[PDB]
Enzyme design. Structure first.
Site, PDB file in Angstrom:
ATOM      1  N   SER D  95      37.235  17.554  51.663  1.00  0.00           N
ATOM      2  CA  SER D  95      35.129  17.057  51.835  1.00  0.00           C
ATOM      3  C   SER D  95      35.846  15.706  53.322  1.00  0.00           C
ATOM      4  O   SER D  95      36.863  14.678  53.204  1.00  0.00           O
ATOM      5  CB  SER D  95      35.167  16.022  50.961  1.00  0.00           C
ATOM      6  N   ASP D 217      28.154  21.744  41.441  1.00  0.00           N
ATOM      7  CA  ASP D 217      28.968  20.665  41.236  1.00  0.00           C
ATOM      8  C   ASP D 217      27.665  19.208  42.195  1.00  0.00           C
ATOM      9  O   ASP D 217      27.235  19.363  41.810  1.00  0.00           O
ATOM     10  CB  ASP D 217      29.769  20.392  43.014  1.00  0.00           C
ATOM     11  N   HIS D 246      36.978  15.888  42.096  1.00  0.00           N
ATOM     12  CA  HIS D 246      37.359  15.636  43.378  1.00  0.00           C
ATOM     13  C   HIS D 246      38.274  16.659  44.559  1.00  0.00           C
ATOM     14  O   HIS D 246      38.353  16.754  45.284  1.00  0.00           O
ATOM     15  CB  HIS D 246      37.631  14.415  43.421  1.00  0.00           C
TER      16      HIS D 246
END
Lengths: 151, 641, 130, 269
Positions: D95, D217, D246
């Site tokens: 991410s 999520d 994560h």
């Protein structure tokens, strides 16, 4: 009289160099700077082989510089040049180390050879300190000499 | 008269009495004569530096007889590699800088390191190999160990207790040269990192190859569930092949684990609790074959029952015996009426370590104390039936000599009960271990107490310790704390801190070991509503800056699934506040950002990340440690002025 | 046996006490290299060695630095291994836990190290794990 | 070797003409890929590196002016790729690093053959008409904690505020690794991430994208993926996997790794 003719030759050449400048005592710097001369000596090839940065030729000459300027920091002695200045106690320690290194290399069994003399002189703190600031490592060049001796 | 006017011989003698390295460094700065005396007198050196500047090595240590190269930074980095042809020079380098080495410790990351460095000293007498990383692949077994066998070699002591290898590598190397194996007077194979211990055949071959062993330690497998397990035949072969043994230490690998959950029969999920292939008659024969034995250790993870007659034979057949360590040996003391029996007949013992004896009762402790009246150190682990009365009476019996006591995993003896039991020797005990168990139901100056070892379960507090009885310890200087447990199931602590500030009660405390390495948690990601290991590190390290510690060994908790022991932000921040630190060793990993926190400590000199656990991080890719980060940290720390 | 000090004083020595010193055992017997208090201080320790020990030894060594130096010189002359080693260890204990300047202050030693020499020696010392 | 390769701890593994570049998310380092590398080196050339904000890099090399915006990271990535002679690479990023890769592909399309993104989001802060991340007030708590840590470290005291002290129970997982850097660098990176907004630029991305998300999520909404497929200027595919947390590629390898490998080896998108 405990040296090979070549070792004795370079030693008395260093003595003559010391007497020329009348600088008190025949310090190991004088004999090491003499080693820097006489291009047939193993010191030049050892120095070029030890450091990849030393492959540049003129840098090797800078070694003499790093001795010469250091040799410029020795007060002169009030004595006639036609005499042998007393070899320093550090020089005697270097010679004893050379003799010991020669002794330990032949356990079965003394004239000191050139290469052991060079190694012993490089063992000296002052010579090593001079070489350090010139980017040269005394341990590295000693190891290179000792490995080459095996041939 | 002044010291400088003394003859140089007695100057050498007085300077040789200075073993503290820091004070030797201070003394070398007094004058030229002192410098020469110190340099010609120093005998042991532990090299401190980086691989990169090994050619800046000083040549002033021409008289060192013991050299330790195992702590060269980066820790565990290959000293010599086949990828660099100049690595051979390193050998010569070392051989020229320390020509008088008789004992050598070296981290053997690669076989070339051994092959180039070890044969440099023909007069080498003791060798210690260290390797916590993975074993390099070789064509056969013991190829890297075969490099030890030099032509002009005379190795007498070989230590592999920290050298990870295959158990097949040792007999393969020892059988390749009879002279090398016959010259060995000591052999240490007591390595906890072996996946499984030496087999019976391997033990037989090792002992047969080395008939002159005076000391023999090995990590063997005694579990009868496996094929090739060491048993009675292996012990008999040990006794036959090595009649000159003076120290015999045989232990199961699990018995050498740091975590109690690996060797304690109660904490294993039904593992153990079955008889081993060891008989009383076998032990009698073994002890009869070893007249010169002085130290004995049989620490098994399987039960050996009715071993009393063998220990009675020990007294008559081993007059030189002084130390006994027993693991899961039952029936050790079974007194009837008042006649002593079993280990109680070994009146010559100086230290005794006992673990997991079901038969032992209070009367057994009384018999041990009354018989072994020369006992100076006593350690008891996992005895469910002994109580405060028996231990107190035993301590009163041994009050004249007992100075080292360890009481661990005893159900009826908590912290308070242990401290009350040790009352008769309270003013004489010097080393002490207790379990910080505060849930056990049922003139006070520790005058000579110097070292306290504590074991405590994860999530418990340290504050009750002072209330437990350990209140006035004027001479307490070093405390070791070990924390174990699985914190993935615990909630957040209600109390903010573990309570290290309690240790402010002891004015002379200056050295600490905080071993949290056996705490299993979540490293960087928790599933949901869970707490990562950073919270626990903060919980345990709060207040460490208030203590006047000068030495600290810290073991960060590990994430077993990910296999990382990283230092966290709270841990680095809290260790940063310890201004008086002189040595700081962290047994884990830490990246450059957290390592640079330690530059604020002005007096800090010795800092290193030592991953002395198996398996160590294999490369800079697998963890957050980098060689460049270590080099930059070292350069920044040395140039601090 | 009766021994004689350098100044001329005479002391009585037990046979085992005489055998404690290698020089005395190997050789009136004058001792022209030791003073009277040297004998008066070494005799009791030798007698005890012939015969709580740590406390008595600590009370024995509670003497001035000059007296300890005289004692070590006497032990070297007498070639007594135990006394010489013990007193050398005692004096060495004074070395530990002090900076070089403190050591010079205590032992009155002149400092002949130039700053460059001190820098070099510290650089060499930095290669040792303390 | 070179200065760029040393400043970023660049490692090259494997063989083959195809190059897979692994870019970790903020708060971690290349080690987070230690489970995926074994499945790649046999038939790919893998490039691992640490971006300048990572705790494994030299904090002095960090430039607060350059890395206050994503363009600094994009330019660093381009320089790394060009320094090691890498073209048409397959970029796998976590991410907010895949965002840097996307911007770099906008700048240098030739360097990237495809982009594999794990839980990406064009903007972290939700606006009135954009539901693609977290609320501003919930990032305010994280910024406050980071500021407190920086202040405490400035005065020589221990930074004792962690992500486990956050209340949202999803910010605890999302910002767990943001407390794994130097506090000032952490503050700079977190502010840069919060202020980031790549929605206008999404239409300029021409390389194919392989968005990989976690089922339902709680941290980054799955709807983001669909949003990306509406705004990307090139081909795009989206896959959902039953993972959580994560760092799925580290904590849950047995599920994440097959999906990543499948999206690496399949190019039709």
């Amino acid at each position: 009289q405990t040296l090979t003719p070549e070792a004795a030759t370079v030693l008395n050449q260093s003595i003559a160099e010391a007497a020329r400048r009348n600088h008190g005592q025949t310090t190991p710097l004088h004999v090491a700077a003499t080693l820097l001369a006489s291009p047939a000596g193993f010191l030049r090839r050892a120095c070029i082989r030890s450091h990849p940065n030393s492959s540049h030729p003129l840098q090797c000459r800078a070694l003499e510089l790093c001795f010469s300027v250091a040799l410029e920091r020795l007060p002169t002695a009030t004595t006639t040049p036609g005499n042998d200045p007393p070899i320093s106690n550090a020089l005697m320690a270097a010679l004893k180390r050379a003799q010991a290194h020669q002794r330990r290399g032949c356990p079965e069994q003394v004239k000191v050879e050139l290469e052991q003399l060079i190694i012993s002189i490089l063992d000296d703190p002052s010579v090593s300190r001079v070489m350090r600031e010139a980017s040269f490592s005394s341990p590295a060049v000693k190891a290179t000499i000792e490995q080459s001796l095996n041939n | 008269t002044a010291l400088n006017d003394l003859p140089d011989v007695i100057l050498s003698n007085i300077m040789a009495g200075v073993s503290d390295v820091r004070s030797r460094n201070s003394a070398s700065l007094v004058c030229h004569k002192w410098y020469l005396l110190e340099r010609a007198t120093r005998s042991a050196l532990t090299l401190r530096g980086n691989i990169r500047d090994l050619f800046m090595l000083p040549t002033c240590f021409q008289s060192t007889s013991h050299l330790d190269l195992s702590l060269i930074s980066p820790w565990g980095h290959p000293l010599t590699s086949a990828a660099d042809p100049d690595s051979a020079l390193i050998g010569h380098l070392l051989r020229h800088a320390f020509p008088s080495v008789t004992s050598l410790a070296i981290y053997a990351r690669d076989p070339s390191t051994i092959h180039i460095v070890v044969p440099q000293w023909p007069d080498l007498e003791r060798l210690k190999l260290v390797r916590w990383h993975q074993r390099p692949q070789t064509d056969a077994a013991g190829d890297e160990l075969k490099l030890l066998i030099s032509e002009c070699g005379t190795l007498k002591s070989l230590d592999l207790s920290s050298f990870y290898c295959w158990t097949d590598d040792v007999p393969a190397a020892l059988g390749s040269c009879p002279t090398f194996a016959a010259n060995l007077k000591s052999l240490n194979l007591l390595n906890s990192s072996f996946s499984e211990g030496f087999k019976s055949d391997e033990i037989k071959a090792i002992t047969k190859a080395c008939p002159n062993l005076r000391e023999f330690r090995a990590s063997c497998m005694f579990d009868p569930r496996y094929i090739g397990h060491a048993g009675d035949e292996a012990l008999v072969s040990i006794s036959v092949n090595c009649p000159k043994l003076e120290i015999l230490h045989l232990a199961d690998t699990n018995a050498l684990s740091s975590a109690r959950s690996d060797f304690d029969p109660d904490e294993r999920e039904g593992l153990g609790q079955e008889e081993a292939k060891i008989n009383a008659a076998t032990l009698i024969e073994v002890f009869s074959g070893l007249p010169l034995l002085e130290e004995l250790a049989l620490d098994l993870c399987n039960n050996v029952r009715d071993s009393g007659p063998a220990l009675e034979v020990l007294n008559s057949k081993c007059p030189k015996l002084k130390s006994v360590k027993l693991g899961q040996f039952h029936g050790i003391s079974l007194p009837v009426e008042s006649k002593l029996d079993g280990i109680a007949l070994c009146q010559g013992l100086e230290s005794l370590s006992i673990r997991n004896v079901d038969d032992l009762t209070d009367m057994g402790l009384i018999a041990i104390g009354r018989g072994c009246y020369r006992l100076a150190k006593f350690e008891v682990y996992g005895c469910k039936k002994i109580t405060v009365r028996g231990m107190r009476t035993m301590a009163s019996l041994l009050r004249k000599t007992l100075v080292d006591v360890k009481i661990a995993a005893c159900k009826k003896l908590g912290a308070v009960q242990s401290l009350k039991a040790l009352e008769p020797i309270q003013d004489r005990v010097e080393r002490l271990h207790i379990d910080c168990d505060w849930d056990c139901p049922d003139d006070k100056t520790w005058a000579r107490l110097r070292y306290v070892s504590l074991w405590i379960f994860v999530g418990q507090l340290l504050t009750p310790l002072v209330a437990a009885g350990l209140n006035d310890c004027p001479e307490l200087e070093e405390i070791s704390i070990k924390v174990e447990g699985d914190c993935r199931v615990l909630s957040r602590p209600t109390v903010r801190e573990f309570g290290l500030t309690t240790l402010l009660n002891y004015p002379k405390l200056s050295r600490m070991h905080l071993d949290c390495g056996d705490i299993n948690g979540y490293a960087h990601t928790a599933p949901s509503g869970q707490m990562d290991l950073s919270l626990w590190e903060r919980f345990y390290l709060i207040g460490v800056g208030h203590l006047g510690l000068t030495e600290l060994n810290y073991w960060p908790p590990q994430d077993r699934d990910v296999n990382q022991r990283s230092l966290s932000l709270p841990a680095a921040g809290l260790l940063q506040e310890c201004n008086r630190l002189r040595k700081l060793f962290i047994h884990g990993t830490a990246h450059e950002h957290f390592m640079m926190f330690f530059l604020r400590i002005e007096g800090l000199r010795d800092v290193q990340l030592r991953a002395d656990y198996y398996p160590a991080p294999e490369n800079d890719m697998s963890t957050e440690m980098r060689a460049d980060s270590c080099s930059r940290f070292e350069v920044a720390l040395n140039r601090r002025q | 046996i009766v021994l004689k000090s350098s100044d001329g004083e005479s002391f009585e020595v037990e046979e085992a006490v005489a055998l404690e010193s290698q020089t005395i055992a190997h050789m009136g017997v004058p001792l022209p290299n030791v003073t009277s208090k040297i004998l008066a201080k070494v005799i009791e320790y030798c007698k005890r060695h012939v015969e709580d020990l740590k406390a008595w030894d600590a009370d024995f060594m509670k003497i001035d630095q000059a007296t300890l130096f005289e004692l070590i010189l006497a032990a070297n002359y007498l070639n007594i291994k135990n006394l010489l080693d013990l007193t050398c260890q005692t004096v060495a204990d004074m070395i530990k836990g002090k900076t070089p300047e403190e050591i010079r202050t205590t032992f009155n030693i002149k400092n002949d190290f130039t700053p460059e020499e001190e820098e070099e020696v510290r650089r060499e010392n930095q290669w040792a794990f303390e | 070797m070179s200065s760029i390769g040393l400043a970023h701890n660049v490692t090259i593994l494997g063989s083959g003409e195809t190059t897979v570049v692994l870019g970790h998310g903020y708060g971690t380092d290349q080690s987070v890929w230690k489970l995926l590398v074994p499945y790649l080196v046999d038939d790919y050339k893998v490039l691992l590196y640490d971006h300048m904000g990572a705790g494994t890099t030299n904090p002095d090399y960090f430039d607060f002016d350059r890395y206050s915006s994503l363009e600094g990271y994009s330019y660093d990535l381009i320089a790394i790729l060009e320094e090691f002679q890498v073209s048409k690479c397959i970029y796998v990023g976590h991410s907010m690093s895949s965002m840097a890769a996307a911007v770099a592909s906008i700048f240098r399309p030739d360097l990237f053959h495809k982009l594999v993104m794990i839980s990406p989001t064009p903007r972290l802060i939700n606006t009135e008409e954009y539901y693609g991340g977290f609320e501003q007030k919930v990032m305010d708590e994280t910024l406050r904690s980071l500021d407190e840590n920086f202040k405490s470290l400035s005065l020589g005291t221990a930074p004792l505020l962690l992500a486990c002290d956050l209340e949202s129970a999803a910010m605890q997982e999302y910002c767990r690794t943001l407390f794994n850097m130097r506090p000032d660098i952490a503050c700079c990176i977190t502010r840069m991430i919060c202020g980031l907004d790549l929605r206008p630029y999404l239409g300029h991305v021409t390389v194919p994208c392989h968005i990989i998300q976690s089922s339902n999520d709680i941290m980054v909404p799955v709807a983001v993926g669909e949003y990306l497929r509406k705004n990307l200027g090139g081909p795009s595919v989206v896959e959902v996997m039953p993972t959580e947390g994560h760092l799925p590629h580290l904590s849950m390898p047995e599920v994440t790794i097959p999906v990543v490998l499948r999206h690496i080896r399949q190019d039709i998108t």
